[PDB]
Design an enzyme around this catalytic site. Structure first.
Site, PDB file in Angstrom:
ATOM      1  N   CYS A  94      38.774  27.208  69.022  1.00  0.00           N
ATOM      2  CA  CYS A  94      38.163  25.900  68.411  1.00  0.00           C
ATOM      3  C   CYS A  94      38.883  25.623  67.040  1.00  0.00           C
ATOM      4  O   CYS A  94      38.829  24.490  66.558  1.00  0.00           O
ATOM      5  CB  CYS A  94      36.826  26.316  67.969  1.00  0.00           C
ATOM      6  SG  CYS A  94      36.255  27.546  66.974  1.00  0.00           S
TER       7      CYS A  94
ATOM      8  N   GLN B 110      48.809  37.187  29.274  1.00  0.00           N
ATOM      9  CA  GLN B 110      47.715  36.762  30.102  1.00  0.00           C
ATOM     10  C   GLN B 110      46.398  37.673  29.470  1.00  0.00           C
ATOM     11  O   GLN B 110      46.427  38.758  29.138  1.00  0.00           O
ATOM     12  CB  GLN B 110      48.382  37.386  31.510  1.00  0.00           C
ATOM     13  CG  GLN B 110      47.148  37.361  32.491  1.00  0.00           C
ATOM     14  CD  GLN B 110      47.612  37.849  33.886  1.00  0.00           C
ATOM     15  OE1 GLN B 110      47.934  39.035  34.047  1.00  0.00           O
ATOM     16  NE2 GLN B 110      47.774  37.226  34.965  1.00  0.00           N
TER      17      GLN B 110
ATOM     18  N   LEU C  10      43.248  39.307  29.046  1.00  0.00           N
ATOM     19  CA  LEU C  10      43.027  40.885  29.336  1.00  0.00           C
ATOM     20  C   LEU C  10      41.821  41.147  30.369  1.00  0.00           C
ATOM     21  O   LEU C  10      40.872  40.425  29.963  1.00  0.00           O
ATOM     22  CB  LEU C  10      42.726  41.799  28.278  1.00  0.00           C
ATOM     23  CG  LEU C  10      42.775  43.335  28.209  1.00  0.00           C
ATOM     24  CD1 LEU C  10      44.068  43.810  28.421  1.00  0.00           C
ATOM     25  CD2 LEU C  10      42.066  44.036  27.115  1.00  0.00           C
ATOM     26  N   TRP C  11      42.221  41.770  31.256  1.00  0.00           N
ATOM     27  CA  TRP C  11      41.148  42.092  32.408  1.00  0.00           C
ATOM     28  C   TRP C  11      41.677  43.340  33.197  1.00  0.00           C
ATOM     29  O   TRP C  11      42.244  43.373  34.067  1.00  0.00           O
ATOM     30  CB  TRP C  11      41.051  40.912  33.421  1.00  0.00           C
ATOM     31  CG  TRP C  11      39.862  40.855  34.404  1.00  0.00           C
ATOM     32  CD1 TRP C  11      39.655  41.723  35.334  1.00  0.00           C
ATOM     33  CD2 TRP C  11      38.727  39.900  34.295  1.00  0.00           C
ATOM     34  NE1 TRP C  11      38.654  41.054  35.919  1.00  0.00           N
ATOM     35  CE2 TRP C  11      37.992  40.082  35.395  1.00  0.00           C
ATOM     36  CE3 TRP C  11      38.635  38.726  33.319  1.00  0.00           C
ATOM     37  CZ2 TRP C  11      36.775  39.267  35.814  1.00  0.00           C
ATOM     38  CZ3 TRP C  11      37.509  37.801  33.628  1.00  0.00           C
ATOM     39  CH2 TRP C  11      36.680  38.290  34.697  1.00  0.00           C
TER      40      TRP C  11
HETATM   41  N1  LIG Z   1      45.991  40.574  32.261  1.00  0.00           N
HETATM   42  C1  LIG Z   1      45.860  42.062  32.302  1.00  0.00           C
HETATM   43  N2  LIG Z   1      44.821  42.816  31.855  1.00  0.00           N
HETATM   44  C2  LIG Z   1      44.802  44.138  32.148  1.00  0.00           C
HETATM   45  N3  LIG Z   1      45.755  44.964  32.777  1.00  0.00           N
HETATM   46  C3  LIG Z   1      46.808  44.033  33.275  1.00  0.00           C
HETATM   47  C4  LIG Z   1      46.861  42.656  33.157  1.00  0.00           C
HETATM   48  N4  LIG Z   1      47.901  42.272  33.743  1.00  0.00           N
HETATM   49  C5  LIG Z   1      48.420  43.361  34.255  1.00  0.00           C
HETATM   50  N5  LIG Z   1      47.730  44.554  33.928  1.00  0.00           N
HETATM   51  C6  LIG Z   1      48.327  46.052  34.289  1.00  0.00           C
HETATM   52  O1  LIG Z   1      49.664  46.009  34.333  1.00  0.00           O
HETATM   53  C7  LIG Z   1      50.027  46.601  35.559  1.00  0.00           C
HETATM   54  C8  LIG Z   1      51.559  45.692  35.707  1.00  0.00           C
HETATM   55  O2  LIG Z   1      51.207  44.325  35.746  1.00  0.00           O
HETATM   56  P1  LIG Z   1      51.628  43.423  36.875  1.00  0.00           P
HETATM   57  O3  LIG Z   1      51.390  42.183  36.377  1.00  0.00           O
HETATM   58  O4  LIG Z   1      51.333  44.055  38.435  1.00  0.00           O
HETATM   59  O5  LIG Z   1      53.422  43.485  36.757  1.00  0.00           O
HETATM   60  P2  LIG Z   1      54.459  44.370  37.225  1.00  0.00           P
HETATM   61  O6  LIG Z   1      53.632  45.252  38.246  1.00  0.00           O
HETATM   62  O7  LIG Z   1      55.458  43.412  38.124  1.00  0.00           O
HETATM   63  O8  LIG Z   1      55.068  45.176  36.283  1.00  0.00           O
HETATM   64  C9  LIG Z   1      48.848  46.080  36.485  1.00  0.00           C
HETATM   65  O9  LIG Z   1      49.014  46.856  37.733  1.00  0.00           O
HETATM   66  C10 LIG Z   1      47.826  46.449  35.746  1.00  0.00           C
HETATM   67  O10 LIG Z   1      47.560  47.873  35.644  1.00  0.00           O
END
Ligand SMILES: Nc1ncnc2c1ncn2[C@@H]1O[C@H](COP(=O)(O)OP(=O)(O)O)[C@@H](O)[C@H]1O
Ligand SMILES: Nc1ncnc2c1ncn2[C@@H]1O[C@H](COP(=O)(O)OP(=O)(O)O)[C@@H](O)[C@H]1O
Ligand SMILES: [Mg+2]
Ligand SMILES: [Mg+2]
Ligand SMILES: [Mg+2]
Ligand SMILES: [Mg+2]
Lengths: 593, 598
Positions: free
Chosen positions: B42, B548, B550-551
Site C-alpha cells: 500500500c 552549538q 549546550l545539550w
Molecule cells: N551541543 C552539545 N552539547 C553537549 N555536548 C555536545 C554538544 N555537541 C557535541 N557534544 C559532545 O561532543 C562529542 C563530539 O561532538 P560531535 O558533534 O559528535 O563531533 P565529532 O564527534 O565529529 O567530534 C559528542 O559526541 C558529545 O559528547
C-alpha cells in the site's frame, strides 16, 4: 600513436588523445565534441574542471566570437570576455587560447588551454597538434614564448604561418576586452537568382519511384513554388551568422525555460492547465536532452538578424528543405553553391541514434494527406537509426486490453511514440473537461483519445512535454527580460507598452501557429496586415514590429532547424504578404561563398 | 490474481498491481533513481501515485500508520520540502481528491495500518485507490478500488470504512493552511528513557567468546582483544517507541541535510563558509548533480532522554562503528542474551549489501584504508557487504601499492586499473594536500619519478568513481549546522548553532566545535554560568568553529550515553550506543550493548 591512443593528461587529469556518430564524445549525456579534435579537448577540459561549456561551433576560430558559457549544473549562462594577442590583460591559467584560420591551421583555426603562465613563456594543453606520447607526468603539450613589454602581453606561436587571435576569460570585468563581433549588414542580404530555362522543371521532375517524393506529390503535386527556375542565395558568412544565432538562441530558450519552470508566477503566464505543471517539471528534469528537432523563424537582411519565434514542439518543413529541395538542385542547379539543409536526414538519424527511444516507435499523425510525407520522412530517419516503426494515422487503430494497457492494431503495446500532433491539442482535451490528468484507461467502445496516449506515464513521447514551454510565445517577454537588448531579440511584452507604441508591433496568440490570428500595427495606428484563424480567444503577446524583407516580389523569411539542440539546416519561406502562413511556399536557397 | 499482475489504474494512469505473495532486490520498486517502495504494498502505491502525478514523495516509514505523523513532503525535482497537514476523521476540512488517507494499526490492518489515495468526492461518499487490499482485476476502466460512506454533519466530514474493525486516522493535504489541522505528535519523554540492565553472570564472556575462525571477528580481536567494553554482562535498553522515534528523526534529518546541501551548493556566499578550496567548488557541484543518489552510509550522533531527541552532527563522509553494532554486538547477544529484545543494528550488513547492489559502482571495487589495525576490520566488514552484493574487491592499505603506467593511468599492485574506490579516508585529508600547495585544476599527479601516488592523486582522478561521493563533505562539515538552523528555525531535533557566540547561546551554554573535525577533537563545552565543563585536545585547533547550544548527554549507570543511528542509502539502517566517563564521546569511547525492548 594511432587514433585514440592516450598520449597524456592536462592539469586535473583530462586525457589527451591522438587524432558517423561513433565519433561523438560524451561525458554522461553532455556532448564534448568530435574525437579527437581540438574543440573536443577544450570543452572537455572546461567541463571536467570548471563545470562549464561553450556552444557548438563549426570551426575553432569561431570560439573567439563567443561571449558566454553555459554552467552545466543549473543551465545558467556566464559572461565570457575576449582579449587580443598583445593585451594588457594577462593570459591566466585556465584561459581559452584561440587561433584564427590560416596556415598550419588552414580552414579550422585552433583552440588550446593555457595551463601555466611564466615570466617569459606560457605552457598550453591541446588536442590535434601533438600526436605522440608525452613524457612521464608532463601536463602540457607546447610552450609558447611570451613578451611582456610596457605592461602588454604578446604570445608568439611555434609555427611561422599562424595567427593567434587572443585569449578568453570567464569574467564580468570588461576592461581591456573587445566588443562582440557584429556582422556587416551587406553580407546578410538575400538576393534573387535564375537558372537557365532548359525545361528542367517542365514535367515530373520529382521521382515518383521514391515513396517519399510520391507522398509529397500526392499532397502537393510536382511543385515547390510559382517559379522553380527562380531561387535565392546567401553568403557563407550569412550562413555562419545563422548557425551562431541558432546555437545561442537555443541555449537562451533553454535557460528561460529553466527559469519559467522554477517559478509558479512565470509558469501561470503560459495558460497551460495547472494539473500538468508537476509533470512539465518532471519532463524537464528527466527528458532534458531528449528534444529531437525544432525550427526557428527569423527576419534577416542588412538590418541584422532577429527571431520571431521558436517552433520547439511540432516543427515541419523538413521534407521540403532536406529532400524536395535536394531533388530540385539535383534537377536544375549546376552551380558551385549548396543547399544548407542537405544533411537534415542524417542529422536527424544522428539524434534518434543517441536518444533513449525504445527499439519500436509508433509514429502518430493525423489522418491528413499533408502529414503523410512528414511522418514518412521521419520514419526514414528512425529506420536509418535502427528503430522499427508503425505509422498510426488518426486514433482508430488504438484500443486497450482488459487491464487497460495501450495496444495498436496488430495487438502490440504502444510505449514509445513520435508525434506530428501538437501538445497544445492534447491540452485542449483537458480544458474541455480531478486528482490527476483525466485519461481513460478503458472504454466500452474502445474509444482512445489523443490525451489517453500522450499522457500515459509509461508512454515515452517525442517531442517531450517540456518543449511546450519554449514553443509558447509567453516565453518571449521572459527572454527579453533575461537578455534585454540582445542583438537577436525583439522587445516583446504582455501589453503594448510605451516603446512598442513607438515602434509598431505584432500581436500574436501565445499558443498559435501557421501565421494565424496575427495583427501587424505600424508605428502610427495603421494595421499593416491581419490574419484569421482559430486562436483569437487566447492570450496574446506584443512584439516589436520588424517586417520581413521584400526580395524579387516576395516577403522572405529565413528558418533554421535545430536537431539535438544544434543547427541542422536552413530554408526559406516566401509570401505575397508580410505574414508567413502554412500555405506560403518553400523557396530554393543556395549558400554561395 | 498472481503476484504482480496488473489489476488496473488509478487516476492519471498509475498502475495498481496484485500483491499476493503466494535477494529481495527484485522486490524494490523504483522509477528512475527514485525508490517508491516494496512490491506491491500500500505504501509503494501511495508514493508512486504522488510522485507520478505531483512530483512529490514522503519519506521512508516502517509502517503505513506512521505517515499520519509526517509534516512535510519532498519535491523531487529540486529536493525542496513542502508543508503537509493532517486532519482527523470528522474534521471541518473536507477530504479533497488527491489527499492521502491513513488508517491506524488495528483490525483488518493489524499492526501495519494502511494508506490509500482519495480519487473523488461525492457529497455522500468518497472513492479511493490503494494497493494491498483488493488483489483481483478491477472493472474495465474503473479507476478506484473502494467507496467509503461519507457523512457531512454540521460543517464536518466523517468517513466510515468498509471494514467493521478498523480505525481511520484522517487525511493529509499538502497546504500551508493550518486551520483545522493537527499539531505534529511528539513522543512522551518517559518513552525515550535509556535504562541500564544486566545479564546473569554464568561465565558466558569470561573466555574467547568471539569466534576467531571468522576473519572479520579475528580482525576485530587483533585490534581490540576479546572485549567490547569494561563489563560485558551489563547492557542498555530503549523502547520500541523510542526506536520508532529514532527511525523517524533519522529519515527526516537526512532529507533536511540534503536540502541544506542543495541550498549551499547554489549560493557562493554559503559555500565560502565551509573553508573548502575554491578549485573544488565546480567539482562539488558536479558531484551533487551526478552522484545525488550514491551515498552509501553515514552515522548521526544524538542526545536522547526524557528531554527529547537532539542531533549533534551527521558524519556523512567517513563513518564507522558498523562492525561493532552489526557484528560484534550480534555475537554478544548470541553469546549472552536470552531475553525478548533485539539488537537494533542486526541487519546492517544486509542493508549495506542492498545499497551497493543498487548503487552504480563498477564491477571491481578497490577498498582504500590507512595502515591502522583498527581500520582492517572496518575495511573487511564493508568488503563482506560488497561481496554479498556481487562485487570483486582488493584492499589497499596505505598508498605504497599504487602506481601509474606509461601514459599516466592508475594501477594497483597486480597491475589492474583502479576505477572504483570505496575509501576509509576522510575527504578533508585530501583537501589538506591541496591546501599544502594558482593552478588551473586540482593539482593531481599523473606521473612521477619515484612513482609516488598521494591520496588526492587517486580520489580526484576524473575517471575514479569514489564512495562516499565528494558532495558528502558538505553535510559532514559542521559549517552546515547554522545553515540548517537557518532553514528550519526551532525545529524539533535541531540545536541553535551559529558562527559566533550570540545572545541566546550565552544564555544556554554551548559547545565549540571545529567545522571539519572528528572523534571528539578540540571540543569545548561551556555552561550558562560561563564555565568550561570540558575541553579536548586534538589536531584541528586552528580551523573555524561553530557554536552549538549546550545539550549534555544523560548519565546512565555511571556513563554518559550517546545514541547513534546509521543511514544506509538515505534511510535508517540501525542504532548503536557509545558511552564515556566524560561529556565528550571520543574515538576511544566504548560501544555499549543495546537492546530494543517492546
Ligand atoms: N551541543 C552539545 N552539547 C553537549 N555536548 C555536545 C554538544 N555537541 C557535541 N557534544 C559532545 O561532543 C562529542 C563530539 O561532538 P560531535 O558533534 O559528535 O563531533 P565529532 O564527534 O565529529 O567530534 C559528542 O559526541 C558529545 O559528547
Ligand atoms: N515582430 C514581427 N514583425 C513583423 N512581422 C512579424 C513579427 N512577428 C511575426 N511576424 C510575421 O508573422 C508570421 C507569424 O509569426 P510567428 O512568430 O512565426 O508565429 P506562428 O508562425 O507560430 O504563427 C511571421 O512568419 C512573420 O511573417
Ligand atoms: Mg512561424
Ligand atoms: Mg510558430
Ligand atoms: Mg560525533
Ligand atoms: Mg563527526
Amino acid at each position: 600513436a594511432p587514433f585514440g591512443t592516450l598520449l597524456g593528461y592536462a592539469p586535473g587529469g583530462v586525457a589527451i588523445y591522438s587524432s558517423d556518430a561513433v565519433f561523438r564524445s560524451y561525458i554522461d549525456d553532455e556532448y564534448m565534441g568530435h574525437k579527437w579534435q581540438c574543440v573536443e579537448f577544450a570543452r572537455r577540459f572546461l567541463f571536467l574542471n570548471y563545470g562549464v561549456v561553450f556552444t557548438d561551433v563549426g570551426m575553432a576560430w569561431e570560439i573567439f566570437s563567443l561571449r558566454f558559457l553555459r554552467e552545466v549544473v543549473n543551465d545558467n549562462i556566464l559572461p565570457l570576455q575576449a582579449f587580443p594577442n598583445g593585451s594588457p590583460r594577462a593570459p591566466v591559467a585556465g584561459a581559452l587560447l584561440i587561433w584564427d584560420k590560416g596556415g598550419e591551421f588552414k580552414d579550422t583555426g585552433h583552440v588550446a588551454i593555457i595551463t601555466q603562465l611564466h615570466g617569459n613563456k606560457v605552457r598550453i594543453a591541446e588536442q590535434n597538434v601533438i600526436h605522440s606520447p608525452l613524457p612521464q607526468g608532463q601536463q602540457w603539450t607546447r610552450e609558447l614564448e611570451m613578451v611582456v613589454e610596457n605592461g602588454c602581453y604578446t604570445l608568439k606561436d611555434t609555427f611561422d604561418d599562424t595567427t593567434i587571435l587572443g585569449w578568453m576569460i570567464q569574467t564580468e570585468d570588461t576592461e581591456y576586452s573587445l566588443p562582440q563581433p557584429e556582422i556587416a549588414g551587406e553580407l546578410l542580404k538575400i538576393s534573387g537568382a535564375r537558372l537557365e530555362n532548359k525545361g528542367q522543371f517542365d514535367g515530373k521532375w520529382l521521382d515518383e519511384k521514391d515513396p517519399l517524393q510520391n507522398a509529397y506529390v500526392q499532397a502537393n503535386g510536382q511543385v515547390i513554388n510559382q517559379d522553380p527556375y527562380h531561387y535565392y542565395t546567401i553568403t557563407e558568412s550569412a550562413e555562419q551568422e545563422l548557425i551562431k544565432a541558432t546555437n545561442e538562441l537555443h541555449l537562451m530558450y533553454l535557460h528561460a525555460t529553466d527559469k519559467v519552470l522554477k517559478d509558479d508566477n512565470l509558469l501561470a503566464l503560459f495558460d497551460i492547465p495547472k494539473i500538468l505543471w508537476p509533470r512539465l517539471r518532471l519532463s524537464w528534469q528527466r527528458r532534458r536532452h531528449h528534444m529531437i528537432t525544432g525550427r526557428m523563424d527569423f527576419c534577416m537582411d542588412e538590418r541584422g538578424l532577429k527571431v520571431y519565434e521558436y517552433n520547439a514542439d511540432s516543427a515541419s518543413c523538413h521534407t521540403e528543405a532536406g529532400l524536395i529541395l535536394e531533388r530540385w538542385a539535383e534537377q536544375g542547379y549546376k552551380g558551385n553553391g549548396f543547399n544548407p539543409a542537405e544533411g537534415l536526414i542524417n542529422e536527424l538519424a544522428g539524434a534518434w541514434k543517441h536518444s533513449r527511444a525504445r527499439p519500436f516507435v509508433h509514429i502518430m499523425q493525423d489522418k491528413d494527406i499533408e502529414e503523410n510525407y512528414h511522418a514518412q520522412f521521419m520514419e526514414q530517419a528512425l529506420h536509418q537509426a535502427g528503430f522499427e516503426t508503425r505509422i498510426l494515422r488518426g486514433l482508430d487503430e488504438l484500443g486497450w486490453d482488459a487491464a487497460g494497457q495501450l495496444i495498436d492494431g496488430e495487438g502490440r503495446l504502444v510505449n514509445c511514440v513520435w508525434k506530428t500532433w501538437a501538445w497544445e491539442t492534447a491540452f485542449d482535451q483537458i480544458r474541455e473537461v480531478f486528482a490527476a490528468v483525466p485519461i481513460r484507461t478503458g472504454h466500452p467502445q474502445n474509444e482512445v483519445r489523443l490525451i489517453d496516449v500522450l499522457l500515459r506515464p509509461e508512454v515515452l513521447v517525442f517531442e517531450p512535454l517540456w518543449t511546450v514551454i519554449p514553443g509558447n510565445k509567453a516565453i518571449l517577454p521572459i527572454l527579453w527580460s533575461l537578455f534585454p537588448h540582445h542583438r537577436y531579440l525583439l522587445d516583446t511584452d504582455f501589453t503594448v507598452n510605451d516603446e512598442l507604441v513607438k515602434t509598431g508591433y505584432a500581436v500574436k496568440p501565445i499558443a498559435g501557429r501557421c501565421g494565424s490570428n496575427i495583427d501587424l500595427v505600424s508605428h502610427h495606428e495603421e494595421v499593416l496586415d491581419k490574419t484569421s484563424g482559430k486562436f483569437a480567444e487566447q492570450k496574446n503577446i506584443y512584439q516589436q514590429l520588424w517586417c520581413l524583407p521584400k526580395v524579387d516580389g516576395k516577403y522572405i523569411q529565413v528558418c533554421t532547424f535545430t536537431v539535438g539542440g544544434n543547427y541542422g539546416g536552413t530554408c526559406l519561406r516566401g509570401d505575397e504578404s508580410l505574414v508567413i502562413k502554412k500555405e506560403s511556399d518553400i523557396e530554393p536557397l543556395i549558400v554561395v561563398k
